[PDB]
Amino acid sequence: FDRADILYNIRQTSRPDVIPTQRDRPVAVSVSLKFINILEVNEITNEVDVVFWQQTTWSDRTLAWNSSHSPDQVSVPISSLWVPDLAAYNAISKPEVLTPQLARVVSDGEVLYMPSIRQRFSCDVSGVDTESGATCRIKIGSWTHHSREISVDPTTSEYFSQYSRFEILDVTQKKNSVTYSCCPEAYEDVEVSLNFRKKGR
Amino acid sequence: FDRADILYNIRQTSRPDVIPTQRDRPVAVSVSLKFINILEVNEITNEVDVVFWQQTTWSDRTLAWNSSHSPDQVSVPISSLWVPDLAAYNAISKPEVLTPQLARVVSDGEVLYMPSIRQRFSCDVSGVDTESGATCRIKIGSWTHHSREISVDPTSEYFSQYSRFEILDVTQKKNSVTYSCCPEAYEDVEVSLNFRKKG
Amino acid sequence: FDRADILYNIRQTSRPDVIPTQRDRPVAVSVSLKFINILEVNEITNEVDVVFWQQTTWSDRTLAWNSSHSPDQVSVPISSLWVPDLAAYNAISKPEVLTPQLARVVSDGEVLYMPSIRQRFSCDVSGVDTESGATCRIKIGSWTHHSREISVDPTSEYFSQYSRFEILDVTQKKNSVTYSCCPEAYEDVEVSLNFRKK
Amino acid sequence: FDRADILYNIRQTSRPDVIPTQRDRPVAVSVSLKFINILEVNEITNEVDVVFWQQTTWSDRTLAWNSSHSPDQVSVPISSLWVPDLAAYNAISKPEVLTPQLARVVSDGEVLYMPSIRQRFSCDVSGVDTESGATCRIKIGSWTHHSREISVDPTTSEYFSQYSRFEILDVTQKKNSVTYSCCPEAYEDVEVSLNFRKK
Amino acid sequence: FDRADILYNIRQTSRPDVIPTQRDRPVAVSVSLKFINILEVNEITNEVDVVFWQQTTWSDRTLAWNSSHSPDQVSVPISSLWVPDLAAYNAISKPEVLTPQLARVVSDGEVLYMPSIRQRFSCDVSGVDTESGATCRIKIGSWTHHSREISVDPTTSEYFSQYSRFEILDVTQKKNSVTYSCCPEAYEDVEVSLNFRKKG
Amino acid sequence: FDRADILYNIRQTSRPDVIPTQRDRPVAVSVSLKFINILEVNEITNEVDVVFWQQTTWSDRTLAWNSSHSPDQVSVPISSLWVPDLAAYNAISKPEVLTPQLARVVSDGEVLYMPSIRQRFSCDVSGVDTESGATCRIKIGSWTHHSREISVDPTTSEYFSQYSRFEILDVTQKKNSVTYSCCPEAYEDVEVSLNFRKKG
Amino acid sequence: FDRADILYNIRQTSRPDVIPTQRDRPVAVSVSLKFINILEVNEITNEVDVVFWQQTTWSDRTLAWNSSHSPDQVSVPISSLWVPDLAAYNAISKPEVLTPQLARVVSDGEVLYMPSIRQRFSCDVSGVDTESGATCRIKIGSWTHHSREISVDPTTSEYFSQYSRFEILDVTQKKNSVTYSCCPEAYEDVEVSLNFRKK
Amino acid sequence: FDRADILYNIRQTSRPDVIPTQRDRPVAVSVSLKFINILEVNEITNEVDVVFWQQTTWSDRTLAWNSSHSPDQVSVPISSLWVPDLAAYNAISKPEVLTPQLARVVSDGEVLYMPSIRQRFSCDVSGVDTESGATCRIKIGSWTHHSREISVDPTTESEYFSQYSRFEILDVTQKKNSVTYSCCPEAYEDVEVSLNFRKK
Amino acid sequence: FDRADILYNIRQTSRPDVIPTQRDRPVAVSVSLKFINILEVNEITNEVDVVFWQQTTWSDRTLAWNSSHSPDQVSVPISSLWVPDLAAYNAISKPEVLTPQLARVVSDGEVLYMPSIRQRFSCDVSGVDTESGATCRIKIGSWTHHSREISVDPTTESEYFSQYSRFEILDVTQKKNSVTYSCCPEAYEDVEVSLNFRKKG
Amino acid sequence: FDRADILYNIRQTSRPDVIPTQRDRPVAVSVSLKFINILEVNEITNEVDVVFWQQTTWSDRTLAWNSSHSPDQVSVPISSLWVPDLAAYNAISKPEVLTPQLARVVSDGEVLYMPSIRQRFSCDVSGVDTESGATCRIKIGSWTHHSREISVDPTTESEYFSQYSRFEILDVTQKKNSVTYSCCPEAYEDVEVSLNFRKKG
Ligand SMILES: CCN1CCN[C@H]1c1cccc(-c2ccccn2)n1
Ligand SMILES: CCN1CCN[C@H]1c1cccc(-c2ccccn2)n1
């Protein structure tokens, strides 16, 4: 009916710890990094310090409601929802979340979470100061949910800060499948390739 | 009644997670930054470290009470209130809040919140050392509410005399953008901090 | 009562959100700093980084018990008490509290809170390497309680001898700040630390 | 049963404070470190700054369920499980967990927890600049559970970042134990020998 | 009882806010710091950064159980327990607690708590490069409880990293009892003297 | 959605004190009484003691779920439901509910509630002992909701016990609207006229 | 604000244990009985069993709201409300409430509560078979609140059952203020005289 | 696992509102009345007052546990358990439960519940003073769950009945039956208890 | 303080299960039955049905407050207080409490509970139609607290009784009884209430 | 420790649902009925209406406390203790509890629960008006706990019986007995209580 009713129900009945699997189909999560800033780099030790909006999308039908004559969408705290347990496998610091931890929810149950994160990665930074630029690959996927429970897909400069000493040449994202020695099941991930270089003046 | 009553009511009934949209009008949010100190500036990196009191105001009519023979206003923990999900879109460090997270509530339901924040920005440091100075732009709007739910409206006595820097000018302009994709319009306040290194 | 009873009472009924305003009188808070240590000072940037005990004191009658055959005071976690929402007006860093967050409550409802706080300020660092020394002023007052709600009044020997600086003098004085936007005055204590490098 | 049911059962009944000893025989924990990155090294101070994944396995029958027409495993927040109070004996910073604080629970009540941790150790960094390399020993055991209550055992390179300034010669992992003359009791540890060198 | 029952009991009935004074006698606390590492010394600023296990011990009879067919000892989170409010009166950083915040409660009501703490101190670091070394005094006490409510007492190197830049010559720990200028009462305290030096 | 899921969502949401009004329209409550037995009649006081199944119905849309691959209705404690505050205006004993207090909830949010009630009324019993027989009128409406808020409406001896001493000739149920002096708003009630006689 | 909000505010801040004394003065409670039935009379025992509507009315300002775009009234459970602690001083069984225990709150704070009660009294049944009839006095008053805290007032047959064997010749309601020897406080009651006879 | 833990888990995971349906098949409830006494009988009004033990038996897999070194069964208050919403169709007074409202849970999820009920009923008392006695049929079945959600059964088509009664029991037959009403598609399953008894 | 703060403080800190003993000195309970009606007597069976106000009075200084600029008294549900565990040893029905279960709490912590009770007793009804009347004896005291825990005392301090009863009250006297049995080192007390009544003419 | 702390400890860690079984030995429960009055008797229907005190004692170790400088006993509402689920097999009315529902607890975990109950039974009232009298047997045992879990034993087999009953008691014996049933393969234990009574003059 109203904003307050919609948020009450989601709070009271939403099960944060419960992956919203559908008929035991993997939950499909969309992920696209939108880089905003490159804040520090190190060709010697091979580290980068980035700021990026982690465009993260997925469906949770248990959230959906009868719009009809009611709010299009709502803003929900992420404590009040299930959220994918995503990790950047090659981060070497923990996500500084820069933004209000609110996710935007539509009446169908499709969810949009997009926090600004500042994080430090460990990646190939050789060629940063050349014209070829460097290509730093960030791998992201489910920390605890494997192929049959979570799958991850990428999607279809307008963001990047003009005051950065760096400039992006190209950013590309590939779905991937890894396996581990311990474990018979495979995990999926988005491989994000940031090609960037130091500016000329 | 009295304070304890007025504060019990707010705590028992306030719903932090519910924007108080009054009849499907947008919650008007008045914003005004007051810089207190500038601390680290880098014309190479175009990064800055600043401290400012973000003077914020809006109306949550649910909070209202009958002023007749009772407190004009009370102080309240912002965990007991709805608060707009403001974010600085060029911030490169999380906001570090320096002061007690309390806000003031007037009997008419006007909420008045003024945190002291320290945060780092990616902005134009070009010219800080010259006469006409640097102009650093800081953009502040709601992180999840487009212009039908929240609408942000911008409203030296505050700046430390002991700063290494000096403030030529601060100006505030609203900013609205529609896109091909999405029928909702988005708003931010644009804060132009024109400052320079003292003699 | 015993210590358990008295704490339980304070836990159940201390309205930790409610200024213990008496009639409509400002709650009269006393603040008096004692410096333990000056740790890093910048004359260029006008930034000092200091450690100090904030002696705070105020009365809350919802706390009091008849010290009849009872303890005359107890230790109360500040989560379970009303505390003045104080702030350093010229702090450039969030207070680092170095101590257990406990306050002493007297049977008459007198509270004595004294945290050890490490924090950096903007203030006049100049003259630090001179005999007459630098004079760094800190202001501490309520963040939200104007002057009809919370008054503030001010009341070397704890100062570390291993410091690189020394305190020539420390005066503390009643002050109020007002702003053109806002109808109300806010009381503080203006602490003048006169000190110099060794 | 389904994910939501199992999760609720685990949250309602799993007792995070209660070591799941069986027939008072010590709780068998496996700790197996996978080094991801070596980031800083100081041959003067004998300190390393390391990133590893800590494969921690044990067993808690009270989490178990009938997997007849149910999930093989589910994912549970460690706050809703008893976890081993493991601690690095020679650690010089707080463990910085970089990953979702979530563990995997098998229906037979076996728990699979692999946090990704950054932390500094005081250890032997000598020879790092050389072909045979330094050997940094890292010691991990229960902080409060002596060897009648917990044993730690190793499980009876490949993830290390190829963009590290360092590489790995050998990793060996051996059960050991320790006492302190203040106190009667002994504590099992796994001793992780990291044989590495600069590239 | 079993661990399950003993822990449920404590979680249900322990008052972490209530000092376990018995018959208006003070709580005897054994405190004894054991240094593991010395991470950073500055002879200019007079500062050390150190890591210590702070072996802490005291009696809280309300915790006791009859140990007949029962555990002799259990691992309780300290949030379930009253804990002495110990400070280090010349710390310049907050105590960085590095290990799981659990304590040991013996069936007779004895609480054994040993955190590993990283913390920075303001002390005399002159003569660390000498041979008889620097002597860094640290003052440990209750913040809010006087000697009538807490007495703090020490205990009579096996722990210090052999790979430290530095080495410990001696560590001694004596009782001190102190009276401030403001207030009538005394606070019992410990003095810890870290006599140590560089290696070469 | 399973029954487990739906029941959770109802218990947790759903506000038993919140009349399910739509667009400030009256909530339409249907009520058909089904007499099961007449256990006492008295022509002198004019009193009967009856048992009846009170077939009750109304929509509450905050209860609805999409029953795509899911159950069509569920059984729900009325303590977790709003229910109409119906009263017998001419009752002289309190309703003695004989049955489990569970109502049925269809996925379109229709509530089907039907308790077995025993209760005693003040009504015209004259000539229960003749062919044409007594006609005992029972008025039922909401105790606190007027017509704009609630409309109690009727619907249109498959229930009645073959071993009673009485037999039902007729039951008719007609809409009734009533205005009390105190209060200018009007209640919307149902007159149940029970036409029965002794069998002999 | 819709009903569902008003009812939520009431439940969370209605302090049903607290008498809404406004300022100094007592709470003014209107009580007026409406007899529906007389059911069993015993002139030997001086006993009567009676069904009556207890129209009750008072002001709790704490329930108040602004109806501009709001209902004027909602129905509230008395569990979530302060109710006057009324007792019929000459009752000899407990009140059997025959109706839902819901009261009615006006936006200006007035409450209207009107239960149908069956209850037996001790009173003057003599002459119930004569022309002039019997006059049963029923004395209703606060059980714990004396006259400084509660004053009762009536407000100047019509729902009586024609199918009763008795008939009301008259009903009159006056106020009375009674003091007992133990206790220096005066209590108020309404005394309702029920002039009825057998038809 | 002990009694204490088993009961904690049940308490803590209790969904009393969730019919424990397994893969959309109906929950099979057994009902057997074991008559203890007959307190009052009326051939005029066709009413009897009776005390019986109602043995009831169903599965609820959600309560189960591993019974290796664990109790075989435990005692659980019914407010923690889902219970069949059972009801007599011809009852004329509330069921007066005389015993502790406790059932027994077995390790496999079986729930055995047996309350003592005193209740009045409307039935065929004709012939109570004859050689072949009266045959009062009592009909018991779920009030709100139909054929597809609950199915009943008698496990029982001299050890219980009071030797001191004014009546003897000749026979009690219990048969699965069913009941539908024109209003409502779904059939309801019931147990048909024929109490054939006489005055001595 | 206002009434609202006092009731909040009582509700929040009150221990109904806890006898307010002061240093293991016993809680002094005053009792006084003021009879209102006598409703049924039976000389064959020695049974009476009666209604009385049972005035109870005790101290619980843990409920005190500062009367300074406050109310001297407030009403409190008894379900938030400790109450005397009083039983009538010769009752044959359970006590029907006819009145609101509220009590008065005075600012010195004095509690004043007076319920109107209706109960049937097994007592000496003989002589009821004579001029000396019957004397029916009712014994009242704690069910589980011996006399080092609760001391019951009659206040003995007609005005209350129905002018419409068939019966009339000739005198009421109340006296303390106390007994030591050999099993237990403890004396038990009771208050013996002697209702001397006769039928009216 | 004081009463407030013993009661608190009991309230919080008692486990009212959990039978205090030790070493899978039966819990030994001791019921002795003490008769206060006989109120109705009916020779036609074989029914009596009686009032009695149900003396019930057992041991529950989870209640115990060290009673040095402590109360040795406290009074505890039965909601906060495990209580045996006793019932009168041959009862025909609900138990009417006439007394405060408190139980007395000894620091060693010994419990006395003694409600005055009024109830009605089906029993042999034959011979009530003869000099030999009727022998009404009442059976009281655990509803749901068979013999391997609850064992039931009387103590001893006047001072209680009202002098004003129409009736008089001749003897009360009380005897261990065990009833078993077709359906269910465990035996229950009971105190069979033989009331031998008759009418007075
Ligand atoms: C006038 C600014 N202040 C002086 C001291 N306290 C602050 C304060 C406290 C609470 C609210 C506000 C404020 C001011 C303007 C707009 C919004 N809030 N300031
Ligand atoms: C007299 C109006 N009503 C019609 C049916 N219900 C009643 C009603 C309900 C709720 C409150 C009141 C009321 C209360 C005080 C005074 C008058 N009426 N009446």
Residue numbers in the entry:
A (entry chain I): 20 to 175, 181 to 225
B (entry chain H): 20 to 174, 181 to 224
C (entry chain G): 20 to 174, 181 to 223
D (entry chain J), G (entry chain B): 20 to 175, 181 to 223
E (entry chain F), F (entry chain A): 20 to 175, 181 to 224
H (entry chain E): 20 to 176, 181 to 223
I (entry chain C), J (entry chain D): 20 to 176, 181 to 224
From the paper:
AChBPs are homopentameric, water-soluble homologs of the ligand-binding domain of LGICs and well-established structural surrogates for nicotinic acetylcholine receptors (nAChR). Importantly, AChBPs can bind nAChR-specific ligands and induce similar conformational changes as in the membrane bound receptors. LGICs are activated by ligands binding at subunit interfaces of their extracellular domains, thereby inducing conformational changes that affect the structure of a central pore and its ability to transport ions through the membrane. Additional density was found in all structures at the interface between the subunits in the orthosteric agonist and antagonist binding site, next to loop C in which the respective ligands could be modelled.
The sensorgrams had concentration dependent distortions in both the association and dissociation phases, with a negative slope at steady state and signals below baseline once the ligand injection was stopped. Surface Acoustic Wave (SAW) biosensor technology was used to confirm that distortions observed in SPR biosensor data for interactions between compounds VUF6105, VUF22430, and VUF24234, and AChBP indeed result from ligand-induced conformational changes. The three VUF compounds resulted in significant ΔSHG responses with all labelling variants, with VUF22430 giving very high signals. Similarly, VUF6105 resulted in a significant compaction, while VUF24234 resulted in an expansion. As seen from the different conformational changes induced by each compound, this analysis revealed that the binding modes of VUF6105 and VUF24234 are different. The unit cell was comprised of two or four pentamers of Ls-AChBP in the presence of FL1613, FL1856, FL1888, FL3044, VUF24234 and VUF6105. Notably, binding of FL1888, VUF24234 and VUF6105 results in a movement of the loop closer to the compound, while binding of FL1856, FL3044, FL1613 and FL1909 does not have the same effect. The violin plot revealed that conformational changes in loop C occurred to a higher degree in the AChBP structures with compounds FL1888, VUF24234 and VUF6105 than in the other structures. This correlated with the results from the SPR, SAW and SHG biosensor experiments, which all indicated conformational changes in AChBP upon binding of these compounds.
